[PDB]
């Protein structure tokens, strides 16, 4: 038992979070601080592996591990809870006069800050998308990883290379040679930018999944969304360079957003 271990009686377990939307994840209360928390429970090696990964990740714009319960079953991974839930549904339901262009810019900047951190620490996300981000009060955004390919139904994830892929977020080299890297995260980030700019539309709208790889390899790219600033679209296109090594680093992306934000 290490410094992250917490007594199970420190947490009030309330109910499954989102009625099963996230699997075996419960809304709870960290009683001594009056804080709502999220608690992932084991219905085993992968579970503890996820916990060990999260002990190494500490950044304002990444989901923060608060504690674990590993003394007897069921095992717990406890994180902060984010008031407004996932970013995709938030964008689709928000007041767009309230969540306006400067807020969208602010959300993109925080996500690039989180990815710059993972880049610095040699992590790969592998499933970056709006559905894996969370929104808090005062336009806080945190990047998470809910393990959604198992949980979500529909066409978002589809069978490919004997696995489940979000085809429309997946970099070419990952689709073709099953190669994943920080640069394939940059590609997905470009798609996430487009999700943000369209307030959560599905990417390549109206284009069948069967066409996506061929179109990309023949240099098709999504058009600039209505109202999207040209400089932001330039960034999207740099994220979608066919050669991973031609894509910018997250350090460069965040610097560019930083400059843009203070000029607003």
Ligand X SMILES: N#CCC(=O)Nc1nc(-c2ccc(Cl)c(Cl)c2)cs1
Q: Which residues bind ligand STI (CB under 6 A)?
A: 17-18, 22, 25, 38-40, 50, 53-54, 57, 63, 77, 79, 81-82, 85, 123-126, 134, 144-146
User: Distance (Å, rounded) from C-alpha 250 to C-alpha 174?
Assistant: 19
Interaction between residue 122 and a copy of itself (CB under 8 A): no
Interaction between residue 237 and ligand X (CB under 6 A): no
User: Residue 72 CB, nearest distance to a copy of itself (Å)?
Assistant: 27
Contacting a copy of itself within 101-120 (CB under 8 A)? 101-102, 105-106, 109-110, 113, 116
Contacting ligand X within 98-157 (CB under 6 A)? 101, 104-105, 108
127 is catalytic: yes
| 23 annotated binding-site participant | yes
User: Distance (Å, rounded) from C-alpha 174 to C-alpha 179?
Assistant: 4
230 binds, among ligand X, ligand STI, a copy of itself, none (CB under 5 to 8 A by kind): a copy of itself
How far is the CA of 204 from the CAs of 65, 180, 207, 233, in angstroms?
35, 22, 6, 15
How far is the CA of 134 from the CAs of 36, 107, 141, 164, 179, in angstroms?
14, 10, 6, 22, 27
How far is the CA of 92 from the CAs of 66, 163, 184, in angstroms?
29, 28, 26
- The smaller minimum CB distance to ligand STI, of residues 17 and 188, is found at 17
Q: Give me 1's structure tokens.
A: 């038992």
Contacting a copy of itself within 130-149 (CB under 8 A)? 136-140
User: Residue 73 CB, nearest distance to ligand X (Å)?
Assistant: 40
Name, in order, each residue with C-beta under 8 angstroms of 130's C-beta and a sequence gap of 6 or more.
86, 87, 88, 91, 192, 195, 196, 200
Which residues contact ligand X (rule: CB under 6 A)? 96, 101, 104-105, 108, 193, 196-197, 199, 225-229, 232
């Amino acid at each position: 038992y290490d410094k992250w271990e917490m007594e199970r009686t420190d947490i009030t377990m309330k109910h499954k979070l989102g009625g099963g939307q996230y699997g075996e994840v419960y809304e709870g209360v960290w009683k001594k601080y009056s804080l709502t928390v999220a608690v992932k429970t084991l219905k085993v090696e992968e579970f503890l592996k996820e916990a060990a990964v999260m002990k190494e990740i500490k950044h304002p714009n990444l989901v923060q591990l608060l504690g674990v319960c590993t003394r007897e079953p069921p095992f717990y991974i406890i994180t902060e809870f984010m008031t407004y839930g996932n970013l995709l549904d938030y964008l689709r339901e928000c007041n767009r006069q309230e969540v306006n262009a400067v807020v969208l810019l602010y959300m993109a900047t925080q996500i690039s800050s989180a990815m710059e951190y993972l880049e610095k620490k040699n992590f790969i996300h592998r499933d970056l998308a709006a559905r894996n981000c969370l929104v808090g009060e005062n336009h806080l955004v945190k990047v998470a990883d809910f393990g959604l390919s198992r949980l979500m139904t529909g066409d978002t994830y589809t069978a490919h290379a004997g696995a489940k892929f979000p085809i429309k977020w997946t970099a070419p080299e990952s689709l073709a040679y099953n190669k994943f890297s920080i640069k394939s995260d940059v590609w997905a980030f470009g798609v996430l930018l487009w999700e943000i700019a369209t307030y959560g539309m599905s990417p390549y709208p109206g284009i069948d999944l069967s066409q996506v790889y061929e179109l990309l390899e023949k240099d098709y790219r999504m058009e600039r969304p209505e109202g999207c600033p040209e400089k932001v679209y330039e960034l999207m296109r740099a994220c979608w360079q066919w050669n991973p090594s031609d894509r910018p680093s997250f350090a460069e992306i965040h610097q560019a957003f930083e400059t843009m934000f203070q000029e607003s």
